[PDB]
């Protein structure tokens, strides 16, 4: 029944999703975590969701978001970008690391147009605008 929640939450999360990534949420306080979730929802259009690794992928199986399966280890927060404006969605977390000084919490792996880009790779996609 608690998996039905995660199935529904990611079903609503993937209705307009263009981009899935992860954030290592080691050491983040509850106030910091809620602040990042709120920053991502008004300055951008992206919904953040902490869930099991095994549930999210099972709701990403037989789907467009199918090959992410290796990058589903560790304490992860899933950042379903439901807009098209990927550059602002990636810039606001860079602003978050710069302002709040949290360099242990990084963006690990992403899926865009069914391609798993490394964090080396989806940085020029933050550099380019529209």
């Amino acid at each position: 029944r608690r998996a039905l929640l995660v199935a529904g939450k990611t079903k609503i999360n993937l209705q307009n999703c263009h981009f899935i990534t992860g954030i290592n949420y080691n050491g983040l306080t509850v106030k910091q975590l809620q602040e990042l979730r709120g920053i991502l929802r008004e300055n951008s259009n992206t919904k953040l969701l902490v869930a099991k690794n095994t549930l999210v992928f099972k709701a990403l199986e037989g789907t467009k978001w199918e090959s992410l399966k290796p990058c589903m280890k560790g304490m992860n927060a899933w950042i379903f970008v439901q807009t098209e404006d990927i550059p602002a969605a990636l810039k606001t977390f860079v602003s978050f690391q710069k302002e709040k000084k949290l360099f242990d919490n990084n963006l690990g792996g992403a899926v865009f147009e069914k391609k798993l880009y490394g964090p080396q790779d989806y940085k020029v996609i933050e550099t380019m605008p529209s």
Binding site: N26, K73, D104, G109
Partner: protein
């Protein structure tokens, strides 16, 4: 956790499906409890694009370096043998600091010698 170590250098390819031990070790050693036991320690992360296997290579306080097979062993196993080797190096230390020769050595035939029970006497 960090009371025998002076550098935790962890490197892994980000995409490879055996990153679980490395990222879990990063979870263990970057904790609030861990860095209040050794603020002088260094935790180094090297994210790389090539396909070397994940490798946790720690070095201890007395310069001893002992690498690990990160792609094949869990982070709790890494932590357990780090605790064992660090305790052994600490035992060897106050041994050398007090004038005792290290390692302490005994002949390997006193096991077959009979040992009567130790009765404390005046």
């Amino acid at each position: 956790m960090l009371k025998f170590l002076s550098k935790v250098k962890i490197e892994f390819n980000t995409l490879d499906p055996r990153l679980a031990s490395c990222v879990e070790f990063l979870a263990q050693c970057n904790a609030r409890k861990a860095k209040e036991s050794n603020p002088n320690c260094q935790v180094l992360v090297k994210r790389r694009t090539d396909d070397q296997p994940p490798q946790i290579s720690v070095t201890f306080v007395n310069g001893v370096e002992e690498a690990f097979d990160a792609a094949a062993t869990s982070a709790q196993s890494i932590r357990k043998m780090i605790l064992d080797k660090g305790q052994y190096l600490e035992t060897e230390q106050m041994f050398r600091e007090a004038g005792e020769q290290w390692p302490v050595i005994i002949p390997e035939e006193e096991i077959h010698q009979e040992a009567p029970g130790v009765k404390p006497r005046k």
